[PDB]
Amino acid sequence: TIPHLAIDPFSLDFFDDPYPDQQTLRDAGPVVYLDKWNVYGVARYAEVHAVLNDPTTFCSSRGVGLSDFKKEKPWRPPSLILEADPPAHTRPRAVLSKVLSPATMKTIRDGFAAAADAKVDELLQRGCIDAIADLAEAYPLSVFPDAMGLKQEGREHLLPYAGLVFNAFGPPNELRQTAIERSAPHQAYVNEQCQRPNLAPGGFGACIHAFTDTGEITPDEAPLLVRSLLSAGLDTTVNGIGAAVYCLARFPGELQRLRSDPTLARNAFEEAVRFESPVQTFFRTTTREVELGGAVIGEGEKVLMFLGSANRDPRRWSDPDLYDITRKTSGHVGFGSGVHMCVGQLVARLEGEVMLSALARKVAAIDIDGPVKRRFNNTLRGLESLPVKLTPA
């Protein structure tokens, strides 16, 4: 009654061109079974959205990766927010919400925007750049580690530690095993910067530690909460900004509309998050037998959500394969949905907005002038190299 497919969604063939296989998964039915890894899969918008908004049935405490924490030891201590269900999740989420709050964005907006404008000026003087290393990576590295309050030395561990966290959500393929086999130096760096003494005052990390007085989190919880932001806060925005530049390179008609109204910068980024979905997939675990779209799913089973596929489901979106910077993007699941919805989305949207704003005002054309290279990750989608030529406005 549930179709069985042999598609491996964690194979290099799938990462290269996931959209044909994603249509196959959507059209096979609301719920499929993935024989390769012995998990259920949901790829339409309706079921992906329903799983995300039923945290009691589809829990996160047994892991949001393939590994089931009731069966295998986690490779690192589980996240206190990402891999926690209510009520345990509520207090750490509230703290992170207040740290990354609307009121907090007012404190950083001018600095984030100025660094965005400075970087575009620096790239325009170079002309032929790599939009990944020189922009998608360079810009967030110049604002987020400082916003975190991190020291200057050692920041080369941040992106490797991030790509390790997102590879480790996947199955035990070579991508995951090769990452974990090199983890120790990055884990040691990250775990040290989470201690209150090593975080500059006024930064995100210090603010989390200051929330131990309220009774929302204890002092021993604060280091793992800083770890969350160092795990989720950098590589996702890199891939998001990378995707936006990619989209503007592939759809010059949208760059022209953006140039003619730079207030579209925020929705241009949001649409790139829908269109590319930097976070492609992750898992939930069923706490009971549950009927999902006419198919019953036993207790203790892993359910794989295709977030990128749900952001391109024609049953929910009009012309989903088109990059449209004036689309009503509200309702996309690129930031998740429900109680776990990305608590750092204001930081991501801010970085994306001010960077697309800088490009909208300073750049007249973005032309790909070199081999594009994809970066392969079990959970992240994005580019390794994007050779582009920037033409000043």
Site string for Cl ion, 28-67 (x = CB under 5 A): ----------------------------------------
- Look at the block and give the residue holding tokens 């530049």: 245
Distances (CA, A) of 174 to 149, 260, 381: 34, 46, 17
Cβ-contact 55, 93 below 8 angstroms: no
Phi first, then psi: what are they for 128, rounded to 5°? -100, 110
| Using rule CB under 6 A, residue 348 touches ligand MH0 | yes
Least Å from the CB of residue 148 to Cl ion: 15
Using only the alpha carbons of the chain, give its radius of gyration: 20
Hey, which residues between 258 and 317 contact ligand MH0 (CB under 6 A)? 273, 278-279, 282, 307
Residue number, 76 or 155, with CB nearest to Cl ion: 76
4 is in an annotated binding site: no
DSSP 64: S
186 is in an annotated binding site: no
d(CA 5, CA 108): 47
342 is in an annotated binding site: yes
Least Å from the CB of residue 393 to ligand MH0: 26
Residue number, 172 or 338, with CB nearest to ligand MH0: 338
Distances (CA, A) of 210 to 80, 120, 231, 342: 17, 35, 20, 22
| Using rule CB under 6 A, residue 344 touches ligand MH0 | yes
Residues 6 or more apart in contact with residue 280 via CB below 8 angstroms? 18, 306, 307, 308, 379, 380, 381
One of 65, 149, 242, 334 touching ligand MH0 (CB under 6 A): 334
194 is in an annotated binding site: no
CA 94 to chain CA mean position, Å? 20
Cβ-contact 237, 378 below 8 angstroms: no
**Taking contact as CB under 6 A, which single stretch among the options 118-126, 166-174, 318-326, 343-351 is the one that binds ligand MH0?**
343-351
Hey, which residues between 200 and 229 contact ligand HX1 (CB under 6 A)? 227-228
Indicate which of ligand HX1, ligand MH0, Cl ion, none lies near residue 233 (CB less than 5 to 8 Å, by partner kind).
ligand MH0
| Using rule CB under 6 A, residue 280 touches ligand HX1 | no
One of 97, 104, 187, 198 touching Cl ion (CB under 5 A): 187
259 is in an annotated binding site: no
| Using rule CB under 6 A, residue 232 touches ligand HX1 | yes
Cβ-contact 282, 305 below 8 angstroms: yes
CA 88 to chain CA mean position, Å? 23
Apex CA 145: angle with CA 143 and CA 150, to 5°? 140
One of 61, 228, 267, 329 touching ligand MH0 (CB under 6 A): 228
Report the binding-site residues for heme b. Answer: 89, 93, 284, 340, 342
| Residue ranges that bind Cl ion, judged by CB under 5 A | 76, 187
